């Protein structure tokens, strides 16, 4: 609610107070933020962000045009796009009357859809500081709990759909005092037994903190042993890649958690009769479960003729890839994989095969140039078709055996 | 989740409760029945008539304390529901039956009708979403960290041993004789009348219970110590009257080992456990000699453990290792073991779903508990 609000020059000045250090090359009021929130249409936008409550933000995207020097300039409008072609840095109109009476920033905020992916930047900024403010608001004693749960769920789904790696490491913070005892019991008394701790036994709060930390490690175990994806997203090769990646990831995490210092701290807690964490830690182990699973699939999950498909300009080499792949597939007796997952797998790869066929055959100009050329190329295609057919039939026969 | 499971530590005479992961039951109280007996004219008294608490433990001269749990087997299930409603009181739980999972403690080899009627209660009157009952022996091993063992216990009129390695199915290797301290207290009251002290009321009997559990031990050498002279030191009543030690506080608990003196052919815990060892296998009995998982709250008296070890010495052959589980909080340890048990992953599949009761319940309840 404002009538004699701050000028459009003052509007671009506040827009420059937020936008020049981010959407521009730093500094004070530049020409970019001025053209962003100072023109006639931008003056109407200033009246919409100060003299109106509908516009909850003033989108000053960091647009850029390369191929000269990318002209990184801010553009303030109502187009708060995702980070796909510009770093959207919106002047969040947290209060309706963002004018000359109150401060230009205390009655607002700077919400920015970063240059990165919207799900990636959203999950990052969310899990980093957005969940903390509302978390403190709800933590001061539900609707606030459902809002925080929605923020955490949105960051989880956003990082999931954004980050394809999705497998980070796990931190095992040994309590520094215990590390000090380990160092003092590492100089020449290298094995830190119970006795050295002494009065540390009566630390149910402190040992409870450690118990909670181990519980976070348990949560990490859940995070490790919690998911696999449908054998259809992209090529199945991507799945095989993360199969092996998760296998040695599990082993890596296993070697990390098998640090005898952590184990020793657990022994101390065991002496403290905090059987809770110990036993629950043992029950959450999907460790050998997943390890044995990828160890089971592991023989077939290794050395697959993957680039033979991407390295076959001729249909003859395509057929070579077909034979090499199907013969490589035969390692089934030692893997025990689902029929449906295998069907979906082979089908996704078969559609990828057709795509490679498009890649090779799309420049023949069969109906345009010499017909006999198409006759020869299609005969080689026929070779590919029947080799896929009958060798696939042999795979079907072996599937009957399975 | 806020719908944290409910750990209910039963017992023939005592009962505790709490949530998952908790280390101390915030609600511990007995198992009984009570109702007023006189007439007031002026108002200002307490009403509800079945009290549990300081008022119950204060206005003892009014209520008729009974015990439906005949050797734990309850008959006034309705009154128990009333008690369970008190368990859900404004100062007790404030939750609803349809809000939390419930883990229940138990005594084995009881008729199916017990679990039937209990399922009827907690699934019709009360409507529990996840209800499960099991053996405290497993919970005891959880509370002690061990996995294999001979778990023996004593309630108030109930005793049983479970010698089993890691929860393996050994029903033929299980012993149980349900008899303990209540009748010993009545037997004490008998001694009292024997030397002129008659008692008959429920509250009166409870005071005698306090006397017993307050003053009792075990003189290791029965005949020998009998030949010697006692003390007969006197404790005093609320009014302050003569409560001598007598032959009573040590001779009377020995009846638990010489049960024929009550007029009943039995075997005595020692022989019972020995038979349980014979119920085991020679390729495991050495570990079983080491496996001595003792428990039972009534057991907490003087001259008990070590003298019982001497009994074992007389019974067990050479080369036996004493490894006795014996903190006094073994009762609470069952509740604690169930609490940690509730705080689990596979525990979801371990319980019984409410919809399962809606479908069949009974047979499925016996299938999930076995």
């Amino acid at each position: 609610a404002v009538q004699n609000v701050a000028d459009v020059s003052v509007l671009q000045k506040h827009l420059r107070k937020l936008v020049p250090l981010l959407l521009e090359d730093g500094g004070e009021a530049p020409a970019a933020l001025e053209a962003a929130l100072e023109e006639k249409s931008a003056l109407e936008q200033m009246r919409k962000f100060l003299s109106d409550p509908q516009v909850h933000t003033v989108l000053v995207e960091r647009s850029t045009l390369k191929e000269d020097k990318e002209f990184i300039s801010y553009n303030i409008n109502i187009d708060i796009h995702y980070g796909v072609k510009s770093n959207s840095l919106a002047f969040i109109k947290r209060t309706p009357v963002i004018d000359a009476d109150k401060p230009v920033s205390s009655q607002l905020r700077v919400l920015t859809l970063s240059e990165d992916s919207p799900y990636e930047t959203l999950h990052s900024f969310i899990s980093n500081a957005v969940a903390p403010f509302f978390k403190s608001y709800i933590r001061e004693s539900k609707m606030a709990p459902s809002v925080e749960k929605k923020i955490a769920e949105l960051e989880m789904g956003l990082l999931h759909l954004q980050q394809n790696i999705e497998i980070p490491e796990i931190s095992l913070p040994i309590h520094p005092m215990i590390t000090n005892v380990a160092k003092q019991c590492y100089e020449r008394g290298e094995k830190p037994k119970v006795t050295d701790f002494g009065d540390k036994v009566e630390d149910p709060t402190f040992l409870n903190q450690l118990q909670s930390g181990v519980n976070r490690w348990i949560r990490e175990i859940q995070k490790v042993t919690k998911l696999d994806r449908d054998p259809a997203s992209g090529t199945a090769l991507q799945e095989i890649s993360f199969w092996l990646n998760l296998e040695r990831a599990l082993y890596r995490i296993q070697e990390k958690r098998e640090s005898p210092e952590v184990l020793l701290t657990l022994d101390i807690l065991k002496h403290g009769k905090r059987f809770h964490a110990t036993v629950s830690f043992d029950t959450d182990t999907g460790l050998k479960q997943a390890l044995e699973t990828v160890n089971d699939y592991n023989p077939l999950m290794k050395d697959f003729p993957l680039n033979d498909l991407l390295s076959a300009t001729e249909l003859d080499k395509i057929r070579q890839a077909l034979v090499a792949i199907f013969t490589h597939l035969r390692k089934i007796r030692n893997t025990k994989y689902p029929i449906q997952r295998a069907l979906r797998l082979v089908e996704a790869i078969s559609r990828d095969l057709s795509s490679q066929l498009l890649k090779v055959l799309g420049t023949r100009k069969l109906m345009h140039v010499a017909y006999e050329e198409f006759e020869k190329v299609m005969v080689a295609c026929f070779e590919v078709f029947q080799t896929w057919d009958d060798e696939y039939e042999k795979l079907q026969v072996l599937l009957r055996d399975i | 989740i806020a719908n944290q499971p409910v750990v209910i530590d039963n017992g023939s005479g005592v009962i505790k409760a709490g949530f998952a992961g908790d280390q101390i039951p915030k609600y511990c109280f007995p198992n009984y029945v009570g109702r007023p007996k006189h007439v007031r004219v002026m108002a200002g008294a307490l009403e509800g008539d079945i009290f549990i608490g300081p008022k119950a433990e204060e206005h003892r001269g009014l209520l008729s304390i009974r015990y439906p749990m005949e050797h734990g087997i309850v008959k006034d299930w309705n009154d128990m529901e009333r008690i369970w409603q008190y368990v859900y009181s404004k100062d007790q739980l404030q939750t609803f039956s349809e809000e939390h999972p419930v883990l229940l403690t138990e005594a084995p080899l009881n008729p199916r009708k017990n679990r039937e009627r209990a399922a009827e209660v907690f699934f019709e009157t009360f409507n529990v979403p996840a209800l499960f009952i099991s053996m405290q022996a497993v919970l005891s091993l959880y509370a002690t960290g061990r996995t294999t063992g001979v778990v023996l216990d004593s309630g108030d009129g109930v005793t049983h041993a479970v010698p089993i390695y890691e929860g393996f199915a050994m029903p033929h290797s299980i012993m149980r004789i349900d008899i303990a301290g209540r009748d010993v207290s009545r037997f004490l009251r008998l001694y009292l009348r024997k030397e002129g002290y008659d008692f008959h009321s429920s509250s009166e009997f409870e005071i005698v219970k306090a006397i017993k559990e307050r003053a009792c031990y075990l003189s290791i050498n029965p005949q020998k110590d009998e030949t010697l002279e006692t003390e007969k030191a006197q404790y005093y009543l609320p009014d302050g009257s003569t409560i001598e030690i007598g032959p009573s506080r040590f001779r009377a608990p020995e009846l638990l080992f010489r049960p024929d003196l009550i007029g009943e052919e039995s075997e005595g815990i020692h022989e019972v456990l020995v038979f349980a060892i014979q119920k085991s296998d020679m390729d495991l009995r050495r570990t079983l000699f080491s496996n001595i998982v003792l428990s039972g709250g009534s057991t907490l008296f003087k001259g008990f453990g070590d003298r019982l070890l001497s009994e074992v010495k007389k019974l067990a052959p050479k080369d036996v290792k004493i490894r006795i589980s014996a903190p006094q909080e073994r009762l609470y340890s069952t509740w604690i073991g169930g609490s940690i048990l509730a705080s689990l992953d596979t525990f979801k599949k371990m319980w019984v779903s409410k919809k399962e009761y809606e479908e069949d319940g009974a047979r499925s309840i016996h299938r999930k508990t076995f």
Binding site: - | G305, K313, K321, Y332
Partner: peptide, 24 residues
């Protein structure tokens, strides 16, 4: 601990595990 405080009490001057005589 308060565990033994808020409750009626645990073992008084006596352990849980014992042992037979030497060379049984």
């Amino acid at each position: 601990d308060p565990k033994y405080a808020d409750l009626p009490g645990i073992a008084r001057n006596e352990p849980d595990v014992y042992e037979t005589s030497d060379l049984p």
